[PDB]
Amino acid sequence: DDWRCARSMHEFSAKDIDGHMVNLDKYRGFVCIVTNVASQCGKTEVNYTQLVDLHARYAECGLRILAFPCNQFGKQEPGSNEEIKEFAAGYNVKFDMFSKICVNGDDAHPLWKWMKIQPKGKGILGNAIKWNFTKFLIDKNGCVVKRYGPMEEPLVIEKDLPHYF
């Protein structure tokens, strides 16, 4: 801990994909999609393409996307942070890529521990992240407002975004 007593994403920090620690309070005022990514997953193509699309169309409105690579699901993110950064560049990613983390278990990044216990962050059949490309929608105050599973393509989130802009 003491992650459980945090009241906002803005209380957390994480290393970006270039190794620089980022204070997530930079996202105050912005609506964020926080998602765990993988390069060798059947969901990879639709998720990266649609996240890039949403970012292009809504960055000016206040949309930010934080992508956390994670190798806990089928070993579908085996590469280095440098390789993952290159992979993301092939999709023309302009949103924020982070260093690889765990999202489940005792070594999960504390932001992810925290998101999973928020009233709108809880899961079905337990809170654990079930596969690559789970998405949490975070409001301008850093609060979890919705969670979307691996099979819910990012464009499903689009109809929910105006409420938070």
The distance between the two most distant Cα atoms of the chain, rounded to a whole number of Å, is 39
Element (H, E) at 111: helix 110-116
Query: Six-digit token pair at 17?
Result: 């994909």
Q: What is the residue range of 152's domain?
A: 1-165
Closest-CA residue to 27 (of 147, 140, 164): 140
Experiment used for this model = X-ray
Strand order in the sheet with 63-69: 96-97, 63-69, 31-37, 135-138, 144-148
- Cβ-contact 122, 136 below 8 angstroms: no
Q: Can you say whether the dihedral through the CA atoms of 69, 70, 73, 75 is positive or negative?
A: positive
Query: Total domain count for the chain?
Result: 1
The DSSP-derived string for 69-81 is E---STT---S-H
Q: Resolution of the experimental model in angstroms, please?
A: 1.5
160 vs 12: CA distance, rounded Å: 25
Q: Which residues of 39-60 are buried (b: 16+ CB within 10 A; e: fewer)?
A: bebebbeebbebbbebbeebee
Look up residue 144 and give its two tokens: 């979890």
Quote the CA–CA distance of 156 and 127 in Å, as a whole number: 21
Q: What's the CATH number where 122 sits?
A: 3.40.30.10
The count of residues in the chain is: 165
* DSSP character string of 112-142: HHHHHTSTTT--SSSSS--SS--EEEE-TTS
What is the token pair recorded at 71?
């190798």
Q: Are 117 and 4 in contact (CB under 8 A)?
A: yes
